Amino acid sequence: MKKYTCTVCGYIYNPEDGDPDNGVNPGTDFKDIPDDWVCPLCGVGKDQFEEVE
Template identity: 70%
Template sequence: MNLELLRKPFYLPGIPVFNFAGTLLNLERSMIMQSYRCLVCGYIYNPAEGDPDNGIEPGTAFEDIPEDWVCPECGAGKDDFEPI
């Protein structure tokens, strides 16, 4: 068994993360989720902020947004976004 693997931290969404030395790693799920940019207007979807005006709670990953969601700035669909 490779003991070096036991020294590396592991991540589970929504769960406080500790390394095997017992040190808390201050990571929130929204901090490790990726932001996306609208290719039409440049709007940035930040998962930490979500889109509360359109029913998307803070902490929602882009992948978890309903497929019929559109850019709040220009109305482009999810297909018109790229990860940044």
Template identity: 55%
Template sequence: MEKYECTVCGYVYVPNVGNVTNGIDYGTAFEDLPEDWECPVCGAGKYKFDLHDDSDNSDLF
């Protein structure tokens, strides 16, 4: 599954990790997130996320 990065704060949504503290189970694809889902760090909407380029293998938060 592909990772998506918030263009506002840099948070990376990783489907294999999910967002359990906000009710998103492990393995939930970005496309399957509710339309009203927001970045858990800055509150930006899904439309503020772009496909993450992890070719540099940088750490995710």
């Protein structure tokens, strides 16, 4: 699975780590994250994230 970065602040979603404090377990593909999830650091939505590549 690929990493995704927040294009507003630079936060990096790493699927191996997930974002467990907000309900996204290690191993979840970004695709599969609930679509109401927001960037844990600046709060913008998933639509500001882009695939790293």
